[PDB]
């Protein structure tokens, strides 16, 4: 799961570590099993979560 969330996060100018920091900082509590599920089946929603993580790292 970790090596698969990493691949999808690098398509949004982010790394896995920066993505995980932003999600926990913002409060999203989705685990690795479901973040990897969205990265493969519903990539549209994975970009929605990556936007929340990116904004939280910028205040």
């Amino acid at each position: 799961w970790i090596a698969r969330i990493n691949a999808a996060a690098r398509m949004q100018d982010l790394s896995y570590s920066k993505l995980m920091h932003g999600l926990k900082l913002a409060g999203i509590d989705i685990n690795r099993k479901m973040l990897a599920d969205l990265a493969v089946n519903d990539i549209a929603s994975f970009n929605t979560l990556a936007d929340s993580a990116k904004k939280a790292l910028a205040k």
Partner: protein, 143 residues
Amino acid sequence: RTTYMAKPGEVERKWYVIDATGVSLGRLSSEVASILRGKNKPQFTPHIDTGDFVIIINAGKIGLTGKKATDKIYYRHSQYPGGLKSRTAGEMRTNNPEKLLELSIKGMLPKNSLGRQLFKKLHVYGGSEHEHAAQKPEVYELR
């Protein structure tokens, strides 16, 4: 339970052209070995080959930092008593620039039957012109 596993032939594999002028031998090879493996895709599956095909041109202009052109030695034993042979990195770049790149990348791939199948996916050319125009490959920029 419910975790996606890729099937052979389910993922689309693309062709890439990479210009290898001025880049270090190990900086380029590390980047390439991940494209062949398929670690840049969210469809990555450890037991399935989901990577892409790579063409490397201008392999004679690869970079060797420091005194590696004369101090780096490549060894080769023929299993006969006292049959060890050696070459330098700079001498091999002039004569066999293709062998230098395949020796570097092959050590960065898994050492099993599948990793032996990803090596058949790499084409290295010492010049600036390749022969796979029928596959319509794209240009990939290094990160």
